[PDB]
């Protein structure tokens, strides 16, 4: 999300008050990229679509052993 910060009167140096200048205002943005190149990986089967295991359990996301 964009953010904006504005100085408060307690942080303006006395010199800038004489010159009447405000600075250190800060903004933040994120740019959105377009798409240029795309790659495809096609596959043509000949005899039978590849079979899959009958393991109907939910696929675990991590290994129990961690040492």
């Amino acid at each position: 999300d964009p953010t904006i910060i504005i100085p408060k009167r307690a942080n303006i140096p006395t010199n800038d008050l004489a010159a009447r200048i405000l600075r250190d205002v800060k903004v933040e943005l994120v740019y959105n990229n377009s798409l240029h190149y795309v790659k495809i990986r096609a596959s043509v089967v000949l005899d039978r679509p590849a079979g899959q295991s009958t393991n109907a359990q939910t696929p675990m996301s991590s290994s129990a052993v961690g040492v």
Partner: protein
């Protein structure tokens, strides 16, 4: 022959179903929520095939008053 034929088919049918459950990782459990399923397994392969072939009787009895 019928009694033997009932023995064989009932035995293979239940086993053939347990393997499927145990081969998907979901083996059968004695939880009282899975046992009742045997009503459909047994009625499916052995019993119904018997009725369509005329081997097993069905209906009602007028003098004994019991159903078949």
């Amino acid at each position: 022959r019928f009694s033997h034929w009932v023995k064989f088919r009932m035995e293979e049918s239940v086993f053939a179903y347990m393997k499927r459950r145990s081969d998907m990782g979901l083996s059968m459990k004695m939880s009282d929520e899975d046992l009742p399923v045997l009503k459909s397994v047994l009625m499916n392969n052995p019993i119904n095939i018997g009725i369509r072939n005329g081997g097993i009787l069905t209906g009602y009895d007028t003098e004994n008053k019991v159903s078949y």
